[PDB]
Design a protein around this ligand. Sequence first.
Ligand SMILES: *[C@@H]1O[C@H](CO)[C@@H](O)[C@H](O)[C@H]1NC(C)=O
Lengths: 51, 51
Amino acid sequence: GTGQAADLKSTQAAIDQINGKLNRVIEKTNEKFHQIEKEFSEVEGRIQDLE
Amino acid sequence: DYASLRSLVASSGTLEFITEGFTWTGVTQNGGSNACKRGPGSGFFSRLNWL
Ligand SMILES: *[C@@H]1O[C@H](CO)[C@@H](O)[C@H](O)[C@H]1NC(C)=O
């Protein structure tokens, strides 16, 4: 007759590759605490334009 | 702080000057100088009033 079946090893090989890069993209996010001020209230000029 | 002033005026994009009614009682207004010759004789900073 007519049948259909999937190959586990070829599908697993592709998933192992994508899960590897999915780990590579979300791994160890930077941890920043006391930084600089980015939103300002009034004009300051030289230092503010550089910040 | 010449740099800070030059930056904010540049970011403003308008030299629009609205003259106001300042009451300077007991002092002589509109002083002139030799180095600031405007037109015929002595002149002044157009947006400044020397008391
Ligand atoms: C400049 O400022 C305003 C323009 O909106 C006007 O009322 C004023 O008379 C102008 N003065 C000169 C000298 O251009």
